[PDB]
Design a protein around this ligand. Sequence first.
Ligand code: FES
Ligand code: FES
Ligand SMILES: [Mg+2]
Ligand SMILES: [Mg+2]
Lengths: 568, 568
Amino acid sequence: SVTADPSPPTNKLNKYSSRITEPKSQGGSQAILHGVGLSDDDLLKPQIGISSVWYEGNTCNMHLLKLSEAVKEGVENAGMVGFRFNTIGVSDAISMGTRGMCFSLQSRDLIADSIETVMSAQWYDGNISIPGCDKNMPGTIMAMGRLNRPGIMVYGGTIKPGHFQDKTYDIVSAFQSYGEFVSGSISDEQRKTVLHHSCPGAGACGGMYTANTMASAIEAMGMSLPYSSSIPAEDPLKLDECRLAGKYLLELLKMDLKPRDIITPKSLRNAMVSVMALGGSTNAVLHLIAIARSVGLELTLDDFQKVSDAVPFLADLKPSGKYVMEDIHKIGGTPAVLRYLLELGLMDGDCMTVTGQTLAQNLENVPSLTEGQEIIRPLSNPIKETGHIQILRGDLAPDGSVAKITGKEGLYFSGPALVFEGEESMLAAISADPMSFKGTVVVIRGEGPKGGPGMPEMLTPTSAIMGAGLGKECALLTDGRFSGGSHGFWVGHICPEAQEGGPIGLIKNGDIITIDIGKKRIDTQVSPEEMNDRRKKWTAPAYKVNRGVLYKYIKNVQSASDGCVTDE
Amino acid sequence: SVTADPSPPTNKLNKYSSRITEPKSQGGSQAILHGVGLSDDDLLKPQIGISSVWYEGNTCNMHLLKLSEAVKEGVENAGMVGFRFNTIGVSDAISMGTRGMCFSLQSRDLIADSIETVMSAQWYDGNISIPGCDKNMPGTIMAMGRLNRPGIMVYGGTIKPGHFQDKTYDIVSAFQSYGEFVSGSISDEQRKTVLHHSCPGAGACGGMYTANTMASAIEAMGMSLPYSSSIPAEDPLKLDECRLAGKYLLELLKMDLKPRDIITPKSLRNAMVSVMALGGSTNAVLHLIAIARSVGLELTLDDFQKVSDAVPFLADLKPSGKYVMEDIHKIGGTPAVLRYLLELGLMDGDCMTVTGQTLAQNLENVPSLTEGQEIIRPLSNPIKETGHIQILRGDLAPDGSVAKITGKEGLYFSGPALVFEGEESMLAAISADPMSFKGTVVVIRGEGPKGGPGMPEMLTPTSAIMGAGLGKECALLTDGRFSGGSHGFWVGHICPEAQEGGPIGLIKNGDIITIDIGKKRIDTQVSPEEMNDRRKKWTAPAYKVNRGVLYKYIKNVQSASDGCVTDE
Ligand code: FES
Ligand code: FES
Ligand SMILES: [Mg+2]
Ligand SMILES: [Mg+2]
């Protein structure tokens, strides 16, 4: 029983805004509303909060004001009042590699707080959110779940791949350019050319990374309109979707079809099914748990393992494959993918969606995957018989951990631990003495929600390992997160994190660590009694901040196995 | 020693953005920056985060996107790169009277978190903030203090008074209209006419309420440019100020004149001096404490009492007087007011400001208060010999409380307590049985930062008291806040709040409460031993929420005497 936001004061379409538009005792409210341009007749209409995440310093978000204007126009075209407002967001592509990354994950929870705040204070009847980026998307859904007022999330759209001189690039090309330069693979001028053509325009990062994972998952959950996740950012049809969201939201107000009517155990499973089938990001574990909690439901790591075991990986999409979200768009979009998964019996078609109809009804007449397409494998010949996402426990991750397992890595890794108290000291060690890493289980700890602080996503450690030729010769463990595609036994989200005294914070250099994918365990040769000896002598490190938004995060955040929720 | 945000990697103007624009290892960052439109030459420039609080559902904020575009143009005209982003805010005029008010105060702290987040993640060198409303203003300064990067706050400007048929209105006219209708003073049609003409356009609420108090105080603190606080929202000179902020910020980057160089004990006192001289809001106590903490300084309730005792109330401004901020603008603006206070020896002129010069240097050549003006009283004939703001302690507010004391109320009030566990039950009681309030000390408790939750500002209780003719016949105590002008012994901010087991939560109906302004005490006839007896049997009420942004507020917020900071 979630208690968060104001209740409305049955067939009324302005259930909330009537609190301030109708009583004479709210004459001050009505005076403001006339001052912002509402007529007496406008005061009778539903009021839609239109929350975008526009900002100019990221390609994923710089276009969203234009989208928000189209959403407002369509809300007015549907007989409603549209009130635009706008939250913050941050760019992982900009902050990756820097301590700015400590601020990224928590911006999800701040976006949720932001939209909840405005919708509650202004008494809006419904919400249309326009995220464009990584964390923006689940933050908007969490606010929707807390408020439980009719809402639709309009994905801003993925960016198109960059093209120059018969070469094709994305943000990962730009990430990888430094290492290829240092290795001698490319010249400084080729490096510079990659940076000028990797990000050609607006839109979220282009492969099946976190943004496309979550947009697809949220469409599969029924909380975006069909095709929202797969229409590209700069596409004319994205603007048309914006101009239609008001029509759809009107119908949701008439039926009073709310987020907790749409986000259910079965539609959460539908979202998880799309993550497994498409090879989506391990970050979806954090965000789908957070979304489930926001509507008062439960979702555990073991629920992810069960769906992973039930759903084959079918999609030849970056990072693990070759294609990108624009290629999905060209062969029928996300609805064509979900139609195939539904036909295979992998999804529950009875779930209500923001179209006002069920998932099966949305998908009944959509064009199917284009004949001859090579992106989505048939069930008979999947890329992997089960999903990439694997939950591991064992001695060193007793409360869980998350890995992306392709099947190319083998079933076991065993090696002496090489332990670093953060990303910076690992990178200096691999720079000075790369051969000391050969055969080791590398542990980068102190990078969890409280220890980091902020659970930063880390990319430099793994590109340093790949560039040293050590990809098949070591394993990587962290209480933080690893960015992009895996190329080995790379395990993140290890719980309890080191800052909390979890076993990962008790590992010492030379401890033999064995990762067993089949048993789903990360174990240590150190005896349980010696581990307990170390725990008795362990003292928590001082927090790295004492003020500001990150210290509030330290005070509030739950574990990664609990989705790093902050409001419980 | 504040530890919150990233440090820069001496004469460089791009101290922070060089972290991502210069190293080859940040090629991903640079690819994004080219995609958003930066040239190779642009990468060399400082990057300014331009944070507005635009949203369409409030007159105070609906214009701020236009202002933000002018700020960006001036940043580019100054040889810098401008990156706009935008936070949330909420409208007290809309939410007043409703549980939406529970979300208002905390939006200050969420704005602070929001701007801190973006500036840290994106590595911006400086900040220009464009608030328009109540809580927006101190939230932007708190972010500035945490980051300690050069910053300027551009006030959006006050709204102009409304005019219709030789009558003049503001938001308070609209608030008061319901009660005048119920009393028979005005007809329904006159009531409706007030609502259509009370708020004529963009801008913050027009008298010396919280917005104008804090804009004036922040200008007096040196963190806005001269006249920022007094130029009206729709004025051409406000746009010109926006287009100049970049020139001024460039110079701050050259001198590296930072917020903790500008916000000092002496400039905090300067801000407090302006609050006392102008009759500013008791809310300035919360916000100036929060601003002081954000730069690692201390500011106590007793510091406010000392300044109040030292500074006469001089300004004939609403709520207590007749004039409004536009009238100040017409007689020389905030700089003319501060020039007079400086000439009187009430302020410290050596404080550095965002002009790159001292306060005395800014004021040396500004036009003085217009000859003949009747708004600012001479020191010889003040409206009150000391400031309105009074700190009270005593048995029932051992950790402090705040009142606005005009001098019209007498020095003492004594009466039996009439106790309500929230605003709703008080209002029902005064509706049913108004005479039962005559002679009482009314206690509205459970309205503090944790109890409310959110320390709501309350207006309906006091207009109900005025409308029942009880203004001179009772006193009002709360652990929350009272809105607008006082018309009696109306004390808010009582600490500890009732939810925390403070004495206010132990008062029983009939307890004789005596308010003594001269002794600065709110005392009870109940013996200390009986109070302690009650405390031993007291149990905290359940919190009113268990999820969402308000439950996080309950988890994080300090007392009103500590400025309701949330990050400590
Ligand atoms: S930084 Fe926005 S999705 Fe990658
Ligand atoms: S609601 Fe914005 S200052 Fe009054
Ligand atoms: Mg990312
Ligand atoms: Mg207010």
